[model samples]
Target: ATQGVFTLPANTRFGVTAFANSSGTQTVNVLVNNETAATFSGQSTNNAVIGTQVLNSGSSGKVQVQVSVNGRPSDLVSAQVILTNELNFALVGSEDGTDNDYNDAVVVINWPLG
Candidate 1:
């Protein structure tokens, strides 16, 4: 199967649960930006995400969750999470946020991962 996404408003807190696509114990790393990649759970088809995040912070740029199969280089699963702005980017992009548009690092996580 594919990854799943949950639509949340800004400031909403949530956690993560991971699943494996391949056989054997695999690892999944939830990455923020290009760095700060951390494991939400261990190898399993159903593991508690154990990660909590608030949408209002907007701290993570283009949040993404990647699943690696057996730590092998060839078995990497990449998923992009599109976060709905807690505040309307069009409304606050100029007033409270940066001038840069969210198009760059914006990910669509509210859907299934391919």
Candidate 2:
């Protein structure tokens, strides 16, 4: 499911802050406007930076997380918005269908308030 749409300022930077995969081969992908912005594959240590992206426009766009297991779409995937202070929020996800612990992957978006 689409998490939500966001209209971030130009040059807004976002990056993955945490990632972990306990199931059979998992991948966490971040997409902006249906375009890949960042991705994390397989198991990873805490605070692992997959990569970061800078938005070039303040135009509204779709933001989504594509979680897959064993090279296919996971049966269950969940996301939560974690407010870290006032100018940042983390997108946390759980890729296990039976497990509800939402700590499999994390993406931090830094968007300042006007």
Candidate 3:
């Protein structure tokens, strides 16, 4: 089945795989941003072999696996890999379980060495 589209963080590594199980060999064309990225130029060993592809991130960007069974290319199965800004997040603010007001309650604190 076609996995429609996917989102990827910018500059993130993309791993793609080609699968086939037809009576004959299949050739798949890979594209990025509507441009050719890679191609499965040779015949697949058999219908059960899987071809591997690796892509970098770009968007206007897309990935497609066109199936060519016995040299007959099927419809283009297109998917988009969206670009994202990969960043780290921190706790902006958090409240402890206890309120600031503490009068006569037992207190315990632990800190780890840096």
Candidate 4:
């Protein structure tokens, strides 16, 4: 799975989803900045939301996600992670019918989250 790089302005909130695949009692965690933000557990595989966190003001950083298995280290299962960034970001059209001014937030989308 490709772990996406999440970039956003300060004080912005975002969401993440974790999916479990394969079989057996396996647990996975939603990792943020190399830390566990939330955990998923059970026997059968499933998908669910981890949570939403707001970045602190006057600061910025990069975020990474991964899955980790708990208890015995035999075998876990398949896992995937997705990042959601639509809390404070927005899309705008042309400034005017004849004028074009770039005075908004600069945003980029390498992937469409699809």
Clashing pairs in 2: none
Clashes of each: 10, 0, 0, 0
In candidate 3 the C-alpha lDDT for residue 70 amounts to: 47
Worst 10 residues of 2 by lDDT: 53-62
> Top lDDT: which candidate number?
2
Each candidate's root-mean-square deviation in Å? 13.8, 4.3, 21.8, 16.3
Which stretches of model 1 miss by more than 4 angstroms? 1-12, 45-57, 73-114
Candidate 1 residues 1-114, lDDT tens each? 433222334333334344332224444445444453455333322433333332221344344445433444222223333446332221000011233321111112332212
TM-score of each: 0.38, 0.59, 0.47, 0.38
lDDT of 4 at 102: 19
lDDT of 2 by residue, 44-99 (tens): 54545444554432244445566666666654333444355455554545555567
Clashing pairs in 1: 11-55, 11-56, 16-49, 17-49, 81-107, 81-108, 81-109, 82-107, 82-108, 82-109
By how many angstroms RMSD does model 1 differ from the true structure? 13.8
Tens digits of per-residue lDDT, candidate 3, 23-63, equal 34455555666576766534322433345545665754344
lDDT of 1 at 112: 20
